[PDB]
């Protein structure tokens, strides 16, 4: 209702790439944002051949997003749910996902924009933005379960935001989500206790946040390269973790190691990350952050 957008206002322009449950498109949306006759948007759709499970998860993801208002979380703008097909309209992120962005900054990248890799200050800013959006998600009582550079998105001014919630689960009642069994899973990002007990908490998100820091400082190499998926499962459950990338600033190394404590109780919280980094950020941060907001209570 409040979210419903009239279909005639949405025009699909081109493919951005296959999302969790179907193709995402760049589009044009008329009269969706007050003050803009027409806005360039991202539009998520469901594959016609999607399984019942995927159709359910797609709709549930859109539904979860309705509850979020955070500068560091990709914004839901509207839904077209009258007639066919369902369109999920969101904030277009001008520089796409963080993994693509990082890979483009490699010296040998064919798509190098003519900029060097991120500086220490830029890395710190990314870290704080990611952590701020995650702290918001946690305060909203959801666990992300799939935090990774590929699921963070980069805006026109290079602000990083949490951007994909295909595995996100409500934890209001218990503070954890548990699910064992077989699955196509982001093994290289997962905490030892998630792999062992199938348990997902804000601490297991923190583990993945460490891996995101590793991605930032390695320009999104594959974690545990030379190990198969099954070897990563064994390695990490037995107390293994990632080595430091070449020329990694010590400050980021220090954070990574805290994120990879075997015992989840020992890892930092996302608020603690923002707090640690808070004096080293762009002056706009307190004006837009969840951390510095009245809601952070």
């Amino acid at each position: 209702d409040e979210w419903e957008v009239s279909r005639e206002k949405i025009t699909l322009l081109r493919e951005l790439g296959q999302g969790s449950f179907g193709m995402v498109y760049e589009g044009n949306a008329r009269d969706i944002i007050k003050g803009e006759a027409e806005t360039r948007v991202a539009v998520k759709t469901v594959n016609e051949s999607a399984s019942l499970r995927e159709r359910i998860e797609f709709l549930n993801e859109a539904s979860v997003m309705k509850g979020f208002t955070c500068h560091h979380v990709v914004r839901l703008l509207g839904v077209v749910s009258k007639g066919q097909p369902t369109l999920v309209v969101m904030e277009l992120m001008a520089h796409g996902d963080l993994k693509s962005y990082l890979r483009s900054l490699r010296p040998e990248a064919e798509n190098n924009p003519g900029r060097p890799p991120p500086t220490l200050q830029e890395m710190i800013q990314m870290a704080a933005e990611i952590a701020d959006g995650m702290a918001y998600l946690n305060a909203k009582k959801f666990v992300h379960r799939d935090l990774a550079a590929r699921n963070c998105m980069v805006a026109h001014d290079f602000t990083v935001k949490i951007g994909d919630f295909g595995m996100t689960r409500d934890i209001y009642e218990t503070d954890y989500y548990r699910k064992g069994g077989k699955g196509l899973l982001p093994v290289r990002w997962m905490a030892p206790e998630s792999l062992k007990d199938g348990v997902f908490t804000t601490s297991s998100d923190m583990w993945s946040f460490g891996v995101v820091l590793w991605e930032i400082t390695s320009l999104a190499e594959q974690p545990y390269q030379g190990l198969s998926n099954e070897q990563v499962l064994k390695f990490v459950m037995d107390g293994g973790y990632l080595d430091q990338p070449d020329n990694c600033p010590e400050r980021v190394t220090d954070l990574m190691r805290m994120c990879w404590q075997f015992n989840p109780n020992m890892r930092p919280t996302f608020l603690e990350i923002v707090n640690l980094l808070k004096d080293d950020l762009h002056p706009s941060f307190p004006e837009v952050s969840f951390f510095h907001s009245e809601e952070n209570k």
């Binding site: 996902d97 998105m153 699910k179 290289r188």
Partner: peptide, 14 residues
């Protein structure tokens, strides 16, 4: 928006 199929593996957890 780029998908990364190699970032997932068929494993068993829990």
């Amino acid at each position: 928006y780029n998908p990364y199929p190699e970032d997932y593996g068929d494993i068993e957890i829990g």
